[PDB]
Amino acid sequence: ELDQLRQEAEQLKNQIRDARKACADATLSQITNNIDPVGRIQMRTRRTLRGHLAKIYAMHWGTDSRLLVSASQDGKLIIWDSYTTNKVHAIPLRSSWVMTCAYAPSGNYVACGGLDNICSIYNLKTREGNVRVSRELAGHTGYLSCCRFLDDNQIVTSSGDTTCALWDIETGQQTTTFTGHTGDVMSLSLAPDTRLFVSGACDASAKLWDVREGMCRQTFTGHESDINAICFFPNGNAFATGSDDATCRLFDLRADQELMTYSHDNIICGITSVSFSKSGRLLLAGYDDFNCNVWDALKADRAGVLAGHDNRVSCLGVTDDGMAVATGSWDSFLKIWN
Amino acid sequence: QVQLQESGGGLVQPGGSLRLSCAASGFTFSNYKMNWVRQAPGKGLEWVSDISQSGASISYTGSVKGRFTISRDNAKNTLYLQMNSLKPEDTAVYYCARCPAPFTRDCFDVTSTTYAYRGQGTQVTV
Amino acid sequence: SPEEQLLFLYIIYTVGYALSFSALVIASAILLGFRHLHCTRNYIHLNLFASFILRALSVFIKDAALKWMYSTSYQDSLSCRLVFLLMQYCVAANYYWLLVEGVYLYTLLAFSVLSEQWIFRLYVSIGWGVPLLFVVPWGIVKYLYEDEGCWTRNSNMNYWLIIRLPILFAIGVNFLIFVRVICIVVSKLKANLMCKTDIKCRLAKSTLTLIPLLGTHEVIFAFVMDEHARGTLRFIKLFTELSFTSFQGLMVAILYCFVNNEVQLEFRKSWERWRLEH
Amino acid sequence: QRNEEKAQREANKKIEKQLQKDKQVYRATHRLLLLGAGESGKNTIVKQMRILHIFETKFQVDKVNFHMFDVGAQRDERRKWIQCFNDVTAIIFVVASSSYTNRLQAALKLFDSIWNNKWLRDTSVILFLNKQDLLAEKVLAGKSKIEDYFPEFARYTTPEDATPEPGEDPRVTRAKYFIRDEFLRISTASGDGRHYCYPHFTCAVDTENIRRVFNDCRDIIQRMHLRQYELL
Amino acid sequence: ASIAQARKLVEQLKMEANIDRIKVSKAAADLMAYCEAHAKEDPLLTPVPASENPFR
């Protein structure tokens, strides 16, 4: 009976593909062809933050657009003041291998996970002024690749066991499990309305999950290799994914099909980080060729280039007000651009 | 949608020959590395052979060296495995696999248990 | 005839120091102007470059200014004595900075791990402070137990050994470090992938690269080996000594700033960035 | 208007002093990535160097501190977290040499994949041909033939530079150096002048694996320092 | 065995198949409208004057 179910699955996939093809009556090549290009987005580094001994692998911007958290493989979580390059905090980690960090929307807490499969949450606003670990969420059987604070007392973590999880901080036990990915889930992005979230995995597939009810609401394919980054469009009705195939793709949730492709012939390095601008017109992507690119999301062209990193760019972020863009690479240096 | 479909298996007497075809869709064929793996009774995924992008560099496992031939046709987006002088221990499910990164020499996790870019495989029994 | 030989030596001497000064200034600017080549090794290299520049400037002063003020008094004006003391200090600083280069290389190749800040401060103190410890006593003993005479003639050898013995000690330690490093390189090459006769060509290239950095030529052909003075061999020995001393700075700058793969790679990266922005 | 930014600069200076103290220790120790598979004996080596001095094992030899990371409780798709070990000073790859079954081909393939990874092209590999006593027993028994899985072994001879332990059968040393040369062919196929392989013949009763690792790391650091000087 | 996994996969595919999809032109128009709406408030599209630039 397994074979008949396989034919049922393949014919259902064929029907879905046919419906997607029918739903596409045009393409963005001629829809936005009458839009003036943004020209050249020339950006220069304003601040350079130093102090990490080993490579910086992830970062997250604050809600106030002032404070930063950066995680380095030496075992350090450093909170910087972007305006004055002042190190506000420096937290040592129990495990040197950290692969993600998140900053709470209220700014009270900071999270980090890694090869230890444990998400450690530290309370910054403590009574005695010394930062100590407040929670250790455990339960993933694979490396924790990305965490994003839904709010206080709730967090979403994607792991290397091909699963995502929504936890409860004070109880310490995960409340919801999102399964369906056949590969390593690499990135997360919370929707602006805080009701859905997209996760791209190491199977050339991304999935939109409903956090409240807890199952794969939608799925999207099109990439050629492992997806390494994902982020929601500011409108909340689209997202962008970068992969190891040296291409970026923009998907729309309502269209449920591939929408835009940002690629170049002379780019053969995978994308490690993806982020949007405040208006959503500029899609910023970090690459393995040691420099970041800035595409016009509506035109699919290189509107800007950020160079100055001596190693692969690993993390990339844009402020809530859009005023500055921070890039962290493997040369232990984090840069601010505006 | 990455897709790899295998065909050409079946039952052959010992000392026979077979041809296994592997059709790829959803991605460019010439920008990465192909390979053939197999899974036999006595559960375990073992690497059989591999072929690079252009097809100049080909490598074989010790057991089938001098017995199998591998080829790739990027024009037809396909991979071929020619099996000569079959032996009783060659009965297995053959998977047409490929490691993900394009333009790379390393090739990870092809023989993994739950690989994503591996085909469904075809039965070869003798 | 002596006069044309002396003229040729003087012109090659001045040309050597001019080229050395220019190359060392360019190398110092390159090392300090990229913000990426700021390892402690590069810091010691920059200090050695500054010492070479200071020595070249001191020799230029001692020749040109003294000749101009004597031809167109000064022997007892209290100024030329200070100029000569600064020249002696510059020479000692150059020798001891070559010593610091050798000691740092030996520490890297032999000692496991040392604290960066304290050991770097120790190297700076050795390079710049230790020369004073035997330059100042030389000046005070020259003042107390010798006439003024612009402090040029070395009447008694006893009052001159205290400025030459530390130099000889530094040269000897540099020679020992050179021997140890060459032995280490030979051990590393005679165990690699068997390579080939390159084991020779590679060893010769490594030795030629290490010769100017450690200042080994003094042991090689100055006062120990068969190279000596004769009726006509004295001229050749003086010529080769003067030429090599003049061109040591240029060779060091070329070998460790313009040939180093890191500097060329950084230049290529900067050129590519300039192409990208323009 | 120095009212509070003085306080944040004081906090910055304290943080910088703490970071300098931490850096004085971070690069004074060598981090090692231990890699292997099932029935390879890497756990026995771990307990060996732990009793006598992800999972972390800290040991110390000749006043030098080594941190060894043994990946555990992870899936079998190592194509992603292995990039976390691009700055490791050495990868200790342990392989059971008596598992030819024919598990040696898989070990060779993983060794090739590690050697050819673009993020590990600078990290040297210390090779541990573990379980030499089992290989000796298997060779002396004669039930299993190496040429069955590696036909070229039928046309292989002992290398001239071989230094067998006295009292060893020519057959067992032939097989041992054949496995070593099988690994060394992949080692020398690519990656020239930037990373090297250090094969060793270890076993469960072996007791100088720690000194072997120390010597190999010493050689790696010396080679790196010589390369920085454009001298080797 | 694999029967349960295949049943879950086909159930998920069937549930994701029947959704109210909209034409790609509508999504393109919505993205264009959102991009044009916030063009003035995006300092990246229009470089903010250095007087009110905190990173000057």
Side-chain angles (χ1 to χ4, degrees), chain A residues 7-34:
Chain A
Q7 285 98 25
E8 197 266 316
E10 66 89 20
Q11 76 95 44
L12 194 55
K13 183 262 290 180
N14 205 338
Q15 180 264 330
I16 284 177
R17 182 225 76 79
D18 291 317
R20 278 172 167 175
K21 188 205 65 49
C23 282
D25 56 351
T27 178
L28 272 293
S29 298
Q30 55 266 20
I31 293 167
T32 58
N33 65 351
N34 49 11

Tab-separated table of all heavy atoms in Angstrom, chain A residues 7-34:
chain	number	residue	atom	x	y	z
A	7	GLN	N	2.441	7.233	-5.238
A	7	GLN	CA	1.845	7.830	-6.434
A	7	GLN	C	0.840	8.918	-6.072
A	7	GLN	O	0.756	9.938	-6.767
A	7	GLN	CB	1.178	6.797	-7.352
A	7	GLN	CG	2.133	5.939	-8.182
A	7	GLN	CD	2.416	4.584	-7.579
A	7	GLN	OE1	1.615	4.060	-6.811
A	7	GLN	NE2	3.560	4.007	-7.926
A	8	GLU	N	0.075	8.723	-4.998
A	8	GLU	CA	-0.845	9.764	-4.550
A	8	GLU	C	-0.088	11.035	-4.180
A	8	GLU	O	-0.492	12.144	-4.548
A	8	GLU	CB	-1.670	9.258	-3.367
A	8	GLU	CG	-2.911	10.081	-3.073
A	8	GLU	CD	-2.666	11.148	-2.025
A	8	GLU	OE1	-2.017	10.841	-1.004
A	8	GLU	OE2	-3.121	12.295	-2.225
A	9	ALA	N	1.026	10.887	-3.460
A	9	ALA	CA	1.819	12.048	-3.072
A	9	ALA	C	2.397	12.760	-4.287
A	9	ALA	O	2.371	13.995	-4.362
A	9	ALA	CB	2.937	11.625	-2.119
A	10	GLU	N	2.923	12.003	-5.254
A	10	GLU	CA	3.536	12.649	-6.413
A	10	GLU	C	2.486	13.329	-7.286
A	10	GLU	O	2.732	14.415	-7.823
A	10	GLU	CB	4.367	11.646	-7.221
A	10	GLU	CG	3.592	10.528	-7.892
A	10	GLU	CD	3.112	10.899	-9.283
A	10	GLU	OE1	3.678	11.840	-9.876
A	10	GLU	OE2	2.170	10.248	-9.781
A	11	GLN	N	1.300	12.726	-7.424
A	11	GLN	CA	0.252	13.381	-8.199
A	11	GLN	C	-0.292	14.606	-7.475
A	11	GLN	O	-0.650	15.597	-8.123
A	11	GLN	CB	-0.869	12.389	-8.530
A	11	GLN	CG	-1.810	12.057	-7.385
A	11	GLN	CD	-3.061	12.916	-7.389
A	11	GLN	OE1	-3.668	13.145	-8.435
A	11	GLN	NE2	-3.450	13.401	-6.215
A	12	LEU	N	-0.343	14.575	-6.140
A	12	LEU	CA	-0.734	15.762	-5.389
A	12	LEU	C	0.285	16.881	-5.563
A	12	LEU	O	-0.083	18.053	-5.713
A	12	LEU	CB	-0.903	15.405	-3.912
A	12	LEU	CG	-1.612	16.415	-3.014
A	12	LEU	CD1	-2.985	16.753	-3.567
A	12	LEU	CD2	-1.724	15.852	-1.612
A	13	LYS	N	1.575	16.536	-5.548
A	13	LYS	CA	2.612	17.532	-5.795
A	13	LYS	C	2.499	18.101	-7.206
A	13	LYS	O	2.679	19.307	-7.414
A	13	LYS	CB	3.992	16.917	-5.561
A	13	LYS	CG	5.163	17.880	-5.727
A	13	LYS	CD	5.804	17.761	-7.103
A	13	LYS	CE	6.549	16.445	-7.253
A	13	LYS	NZ	7.191	16.319	-8.590
A	14	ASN	N	2.209	17.244	-8.188
A	14	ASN	CA	2.024	17.718	-9.555
A	14	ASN	C	0.831	18.662	-9.655
A	14	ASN	O	0.893	19.681	-10.353
A	14	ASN	CB	1.848	16.529	-10.500
A	14	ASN	CG	2.255	16.853	-11.924
A	14	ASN	OD1	2.286	18.015	-12.326
A	14	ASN	ND2	2.570	15.820	-12.698
A	15	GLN	N	-0.265	18.336	-8.966
A	15	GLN	CA	-1.428	19.220	-8.957
A	15	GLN	C	-1.097	20.561	-8.315
A	15	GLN	O	-1.525	21.615	-8.804
A	15	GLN	CB	-2.591	18.546	-8.228
A	15	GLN	CG	-3.856	19.385	-8.155
A	15	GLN	CD	-3.976	20.150	-6.852
A	15	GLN	OE1	-3.481	19.712	-5.814
A	15	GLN	NE2	-4.635	21.302	-6.900
A	16	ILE	N	-0.339	20.542	-7.217
A	16	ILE	CA	0.061	21.787	-6.566
A	16	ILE	C	0.921	22.625	-7.505
A	16	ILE	O	0.748	23.845	-7.610
A	16	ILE	CB	0.788	21.490	-5.242
A	16	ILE	CG1	-0.213	21.078	-4.164
A	16	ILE	CG2	1.592	22.697	-4.783
A	16	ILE	CD1	0.432	20.698	-2.850
A	17	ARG	N	1.864	21.982	-8.200
A	17	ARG	CA	2.716	22.704	-9.139
A	17	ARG	C	1.903	23.298	-10.283
A	17	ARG	O	2.148	24.436	-10.702
A	17	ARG	CB	3.805	21.775	-9.676
A	17	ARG	CG	4.787	22.445	-10.621
A	17	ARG	CD	5.049	21.581	-11.844
A	17	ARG	NE	3.947	21.631	-12.800
A	17	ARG	CZ	3.748	22.621	-13.663
A	17	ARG	NH1	4.581	23.654	-13.696
A	17	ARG	NH2	2.718	22.581	-14.496
A	18	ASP	N	0.936	22.541	-10.805
A	18	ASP	CA	0.088	23.058	-11.876
A	18	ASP	C	-0.740	24.245	-11.402
A	18	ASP	O	-0.894	25.235	-12.130
A	18	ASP	CB	-0.819	21.950	-12.411
A	18	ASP	CG	-0.051	20.880	-13.162
A	18	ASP	OD1	0.850	21.237	-13.950
A	18	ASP	OD2	-0.348	19.684	-12.966
A	19	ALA	N	-1.287	24.166	-10.187
A	19	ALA	CA	-2.050	25.286	-9.646
A	19	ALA	C	-1.168	26.514	-9.458
A	19	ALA	O	-1.590	27.641	-9.746
A	19	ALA	CB	-2.709	24.886	-8.327
A	20	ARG	N	0.061	26.315	-8.974
A	20	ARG	CA	0.986	27.434	-8.821
A	20	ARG	C	1.319	28.063	-10.167
A	20	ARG	O	1.378	29.292	-10.289
A	20	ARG	CB	2.263	26.970	-8.120
A	20	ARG	CG	2.155	26.889	-6.608
A	20	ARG	CD	3.387	26.233	-6.008
A	20	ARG	NE	3.458	26.421	-4.563
A	20	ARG	CZ	4.377	25.863	-3.782
A	20	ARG	NH1	5.309	25.079	-4.308
A	20	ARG	NH2	4.366	26.087	-2.476
A	21	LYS	N	1.547	27.234	-11.188
A	21	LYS	CA	1.831	27.759	-12.520
A	21	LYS	C	0.643	28.538	-13.070
A	21	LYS	O	0.816	29.591	-13.695
A	21	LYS	CB	2.209	26.618	-13.465
A	21	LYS	CG	2.712	27.079	-14.822
A	21	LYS	CD	2.483	26.017	-15.884
A	21	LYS	CE	1.000	25.775	-16.108
A	21	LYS	NZ	0.253	27.049	-16.299
A	22	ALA	N	-0.572	28.030	-12.854
A	22	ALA	CA	-1.764	28.735	-13.316
A	22	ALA	C	-1.939	30.065	-12.594
A	22	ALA	O	-2.350	31.059	-13.204
A	22	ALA	CB	-2.999	27.855	-13.130
A	23	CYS	N	-1.634	30.104	-11.294
A	23	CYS	CA	-1.816	31.326	-10.519
A	23	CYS	C	-0.858	32.437	-10.934
A	23	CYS	O	-1.085	33.596	-10.573
A	23	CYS	CB	-1.646	31.030	-9.027
A	23	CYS	SG	-3.084	30.260	-8.249
A	24	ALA	N	0.201	32.118	-11.674
A	24	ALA	CA	1.190	33.105	-12.105
A	24	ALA	C	0.820	33.576	-13.507
A	24	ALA	O	1.156	32.929	-14.500
A	24	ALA	CB	2.596	32.517	-12.066
A	25	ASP	N	0.125	34.711	-13.583
A	25	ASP	CA	-0.275	35.282	-14.862
A	25	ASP	C	0.760	36.232	-15.447
A	25	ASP	O	0.617	36.641	-16.604
A	25	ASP	CB	-1.612	36.019	-14.716
A	25	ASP	CG	-1.571	37.097	-13.649
A	25	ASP	OD1	-0.571	37.166	-12.906
A	25	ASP	OD2	-2.542	37.877	-13.556
A	26	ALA	N	1.793	36.585	-14.689
A	26	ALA	CA	2.819	37.513	-15.149
A	26	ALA	C	4.057	37.321	-14.280
A	26	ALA	O	4.135	36.385	-13.477
A	26	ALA	CB	2.308	38.957	-15.112
A	27	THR	N	5.032	38.213	-14.442
A	27	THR	CA	6.257	38.156	-13.659
A	27	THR	C	6.752	39.571	-13.409
A	27	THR	O	6.368	40.519	-14.099
A	27	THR	CB	7.343	37.327	-14.356
A	27	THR	OG1	8.536	37.339	-13.562
A	27	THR	CG2	7.652	37.894	-15.727
A	28	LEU	N	7.624	39.699	-12.408
A	28	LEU	CA	8.127	40.999	-11.982
A	28	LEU	C	9.069	41.640	-12.990
A	28	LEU	O	9.430	42.808	-12.812
A	28	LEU	CB	8.836	40.866	-10.635
A	28	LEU	CG	8.016	40.988	-9.349
A	28	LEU	CD1	7.492	42.400	-9.202
A	28	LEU	CD2	6.869	40.000	-9.338
A	29	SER	N	9.484	40.911	-14.028
A	29	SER	CA	10.376	41.491	-15.026
A	29	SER	C	9.723	42.673	-15.731
A	29	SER	O	10.374	43.693	-15.982
A	29	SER	CB	10.796	40.426	-16.038
A	29	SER	OG	11.521	39.383	-15.409
A	30	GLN	N	8.434	42.557	-16.057
A	30	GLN	CA	7.722	43.630	-16.736
A	30	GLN	C	6.793	44.423	-15.827
A	30	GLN	O	6.345	45.504	-16.223
A	30	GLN	CB	6.912	43.072	-17.914
A	30	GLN	CG	5.947	41.962	-17.539
A	30	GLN	CD	6.548	40.584	-17.734
A	30	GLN	OE1	7.767	40.430	-17.794
A	30	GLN	NE2	5.692	39.575	-17.841
A	31	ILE	N	6.484	43.919	-14.631
A	31	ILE	CA	5.633	44.678	-13.717
A	31	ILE	C	6.379	45.890	-13.172
A	31	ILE	O	5.829	46.995	-13.104
A	31	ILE	CB	5.115	43.773	-12.586
A	31	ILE	CG1	4.161	42.715	-13.144
A	31	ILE	CG2	4.419	44.598	-11.515
A	31	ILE	CD1	3.847	41.602	-12.169
A	32	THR	N	7.639	45.707	-12.780
A	32	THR	CA	8.443	46.776	-12.202
A	32	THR	C	9.461	47.350	-13.178
A	32	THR	O	10.347	48.101	-12.758
A	32	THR	CB	9.157	46.280	-10.944
A	32	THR	OG1	9.968	45.145	-11.269
A	32	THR	CG2	8.149	45.891	-9.878
A	33	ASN	N	9.362	47.017	-14.467
A	33	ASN	CA	10.317	47.534	-15.442
A	33	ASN	C	10.223	49.045	-15.605
A	33	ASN	O	11.192	49.669	-16.053
A	33	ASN	CB	10.119	46.846	-16.795
A	33	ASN	CG	8.770	47.155	-17.418
A	33	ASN	OD1	7.895	47.746	-16.786
A	33	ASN	ND2	8.597	46.751	-18.672
A	34	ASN	N	9.085	49.645	-15.258
A	34	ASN	CA	8.893	51.085	-15.353
A	34	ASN	C	9.214	51.809	-14.051
A	34	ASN	O	8.709	52.915	-13.825
A	34	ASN	CB	7.459	51.396	-15.787
A	34	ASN	CG	6.425	50.642	-14.973
A	34	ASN	OD1	6.745	50.036	-13.951
A	34	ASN	ND2	5.177	50.677	-15.424
